[PDB]
Amino acid sequence: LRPGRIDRKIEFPPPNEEARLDILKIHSRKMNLTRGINLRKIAELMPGASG
Amino acid sequence: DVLPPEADSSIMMLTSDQKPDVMYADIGGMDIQKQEVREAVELPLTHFELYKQIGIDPPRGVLMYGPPG
Amino acid sequence: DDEFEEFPAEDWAGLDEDEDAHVWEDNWDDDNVEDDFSNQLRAELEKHGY
Amino acid sequence: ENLEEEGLPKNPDLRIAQLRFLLSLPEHRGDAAVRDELMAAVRDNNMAPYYEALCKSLDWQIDVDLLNKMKKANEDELKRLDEELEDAEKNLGESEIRDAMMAKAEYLCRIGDKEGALTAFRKTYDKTVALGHRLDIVFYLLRIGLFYMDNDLITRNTEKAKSLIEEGGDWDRRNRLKVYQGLYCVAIRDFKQAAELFLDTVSTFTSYELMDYKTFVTYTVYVSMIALERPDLREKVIKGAEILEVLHSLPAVRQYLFSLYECRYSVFFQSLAVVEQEMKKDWLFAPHYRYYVREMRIHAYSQLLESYRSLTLGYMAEAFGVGVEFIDQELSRFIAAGRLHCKIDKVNEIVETNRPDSKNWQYQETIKKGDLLLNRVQKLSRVINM
Amino acid sequence: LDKQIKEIKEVIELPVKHPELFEALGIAQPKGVLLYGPPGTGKTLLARAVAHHTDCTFIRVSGSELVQKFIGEGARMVRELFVMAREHAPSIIFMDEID
Ligand SMILES: Nc1ncnc2c1ncn2[C@@H]1O[C@H](COP(=O)(O)OP(=O)(O)OP(=O)(O)O)[C@@H](O)[C@H]1O
Ligand SMILES: Nc1ncnc2c1ncn2[C@@H]1O[C@H](COP(=O)(O)OP(=O)(O)O)[C@@H](O)[C@H]1O
Ligand SMILES: [Mg+2]
């Protein structure tokens, strides 16, 4: 943690609703999905979830 | 020469007589473990096309772990 | 090559605007001259007084 | 409600191709509404090369002021994209470089600059790292090919997309590729494969950049009634939940399908005339509207003759709501073509059905296709010798 | 993770592709990056992606003995891995703390 050793520290917070929706869109793309899946609702159904 | 692939094996497959007598009904109360093993071992063997159609990648291996006995 | 300039090359005068440019199992029956089936059915619907 | 937002980018807008085809038709050349919509799309997208092609092929009067304004807008936007690419290659990273080229290629495709769009898309693909981005570029090329009906482009990009989807297990892209392939098979009279792909993607359709879902279901039904057997049509289309749900809003298509399935042959013939007038105006079904309809007629005739040993000509005419002479001519034409397994006793006006073995029908196709392949082999050897 | 993508880009992509930017700025090019967050948030995913897009060799240092034979028969110091990394420069040495 001394300055100059790590030139940049980047935080990876757990995804919010929109980031969870993006991750859901990325990972459900590998599946035979019926048309009209409300991935937004499923993202809202996963509070405090990781990728 | 090239030997047949099934030949030259110090380890043999289980014959009919070597099959254990333990049934699924003999095992009591491991429905979760039975379901996971079936979905990861015995179902992909017979339903690999279904796994491909759905988009699931069948697990190559299964690690069964827990306390002894 | 010994191209056949002896024979009179009739002028092309064709349509270079992709007249057909298709790859099917095309058959002669599509080229039968006739009005559309809609016109035939319309002309025979009233032939019975309907 | 977010259906259309799910689809791929609408470049090129296939509605533009449909309207251009409509204007190519002699019946609808002077339609003011079609011309107005096409001109509105051209003006909004500033399609200078497409405007040139439109006025050249259709022999229109080029609005000099409009053309100059659209060309100036195109030049300024191209200069801006070139500046963005130049900034990216010196300061930003490879991802931003690829983004700048993707913007340039998208603009070139949007304005109808087909060759420049292809060149820019090839350049962008050459240094695109993400597999899905490469597959999106391939879908862009497929859409461009469908826009101009470029068979070579469509086939090459379909093979490339199949390979890319095999590499990365993207089932969504697989469904989109199935939809595109079904559209192409419709374009090239391959109704069996088109029906198969459409039925596979009837419950996963998201390609709203190609067509509306209602239009997709209508196309699926149209190809299914010509490419499917009666049990397959019953199981997949007649009892299909999604297809029936869509057909609830399409009374004409449901009537057309069920009249054939329920053997309401006069209703089926009327719906077939309506469907024919629909196909004539569709740029995908226009080359085959004469073929498709004829085949459908044969199907109807075959169906009416499938279960009966013999049928009087009057009964056939009454069932189809046409004259006896019309039935005579149609049946004679289709029997002479070898498509109907029956013979007409015109003396008593009785159509007697036949049951020719599948061996003869396999042998005739074997002769035909073997002769085609033999001609290919002969001409290939002819090329080889000299 | 667009913000994280940009942040890791400015530190790992720019020094490899454009050292002249840092030389003109008169600052030392970054050499160490920390990615901190709950498990499963994409730290390894973003590290692998940034190694993949910049054509930088991605080396994962788990400290496992199973791979030690590949690192070197000595194995007395972890810096013995550097000989491999220098052979595949540009390189990204990645280590994930399980904790
Ligand atoms: N669910 C169960 N129902 C009935 N018997 C059980 C059950 N689970 C374990 N047993 C008993 O466990 C005994 C043998 O243990 P088992 O070999 O299955 O354990 P293990 O997990 O393989 O053990 P270890 O880790 O020591 O190898 C059998 O005699 C069997 O009766
Ligand atoms: N933000 C994200 N977007 C997409 N996928 C993610 C994201 N975060 C995690 N994943 C998925 O989770 C899996 C494991 O995550 P990983 O990156 O190993 O977590 P960590 O950041 O703790 O190392 C990866 O295969 C990745 O596909
Ligand atoms: Mg992790």
From Swiss-Prot, chain B:
It comes from the Eukaryota. It is found in: Cytoplasm; Nucleus. Component of the 19S proteasome regulatory particle complex. The 26S proteasome consists of a 20S core particle (CP) and two 19S regulatory subunits (RP). The regulatory particle is made of a lid composed of 9 subunits, a base containing 6 ATPases including PSMC4 and few additional components. Interacts with NR1I3. Interacts with PAAF1. Interacts with TRIM5. Interacts with ZFAND1. Belongs to the AAA ATPase family. Component of the 26S proteasome, a multiprotein complex involved in the ATP-dependent degradation of ubiquitinated proteins. This complex plays a key role in the maintenance of protein homeostasis by removing misfolded or damaged proteins, which could impair cellular functions, and by removing proteins whose functions are no longer required. Therefore, the proteasome participates in numerous cellular processes, including cell cycle progression, apoptosis, or DNA damage repair. This is 26S proteasome regulatory subunit 6B. It comes from Homo sapiens. The chain holds residues 141 to 209 of 418 of the full protein.
Curated annotation (Swiss-Prot), chain C:
GO terms for biological process: double-strand break repair via homologous recombination; mRNA export from nucleus; proteasome assembly; proteasome-mediated ubiquitin-dependent protein catabolic process. The keyword Oxidoreductase does not apply. The keyword Amino-acid biosynthesis does not apply. This is 26S proteasome complex subunit SEM1. It comes from Homo sapiens (Human). Keywords: Nucleus, Proteasome. Component of the 26S proteasome, a multiprotein complex involved in the ATP-dependent degradation of ubiquitinated proteins. This complex plays a key role in the maintenance of protein homeostasis by removing misfolded or damaged proteins, which could impair cellular functions, and by removing proteins whose functions are no longer required. Therefore, the proteasome participates in numerous cellular processes, including cell cycle progression, apoptosis, or DNA damage repair. One of its GO terms (cellular component) is proteasome complex. It is found in: Nucleus. It comes from the Eukaryota. Expressed in limb bud, craniofacial primordia and skin. The chain holds residues 16 to 65 of 70 of the full protein. Belongs to the DSS1/SEM1 family.
From Swiss-Prot, chain D:
GO terms for cellular component: cytosol; extracellular region; ficolin-1-rich granule lumen; nucleoplasm; proteasome accessory complex; proteasome complex; proteasome regulatory particle; secretory granule lumen. This is 26S proteasome non-ATPase regulatory subunit 6. InterPro entries: PCI_dom, Rpn7/CSN1, Rpn7_N, RPN7_PSMD6_C, TPR-like_helical_dom_sf, WH_DNA-bd_sf. The gene is PSMD6. Belongs to the proteasome subunit S10 family. Component of the 19S proteasome regulatory particle complex. The 26S proteasome consists of a 20S core particle (CP) and two 19S regulatory subunits (RP). The regulatory particle is made of a lid composed of 9 subunits including PSMD6, a base containing 6 ATPases and few additional components. It comes from the Eukaryota. Pfam families: PCI (PF01399), RPN7 (PF10602), RPN7_PSMD6_C (PF21154). GO terms for biological process: proteasome-mediated ubiquitin-dependent protein catabolic process. Transmembrane segments: none annotated. It comes from Homo sapiens. Residues 190-358 form the PCI domain. Keywords: Proteasome.
UniProtKB/Swiss-Prot annotation, chain E:
GO terms for biological process: negative regulation of DNA-templated transcription; negative regulation of programmed cell death; positive regulation of DNA-templated transcription; positive regulation of inclusion body assembly; positive regulation of proteasomal protein catabolic process; proteasome-mediated ubiquitin-dependent protein catabolic process; regulation of transcription by RNA polymerase II. Keywords: Acetylation, ATP-binding, Cytoplasm, Nucleotide-binding, Nucleus, Phosphoprotein, Proteasome. One of its GO terms (cellular component) is proteasome accessory complex. GO terms for molecular function: ATP binding; ATP hydrolysis activity; DNA-binding transcription factor binding; general transcription initiation factor binding; proteasome-activating activity; TBP-class protein binding; thyrotropin-releasing hormone receptor binding; transcription factor binding. Its main location: cytoplasm. ATP binds at G37, P38, P39, G40, T41, G42, K43, T44. It is found in: Cytoplasm; Nucleus. The keyword Cytoplasm applies. The keyword ATP-binding applies. The modification N6-acetyllysine is found at K69. Belongs to the AAA ATPase family. This is 26S proteasome regulatory subunit 8. The lineage of its organism: Eukaryota, Metazoa, Chordata, Craniata, Vertebrata. The gene is PSMC5. The chain holds residues 154 to 252 of 406 of the full protein.
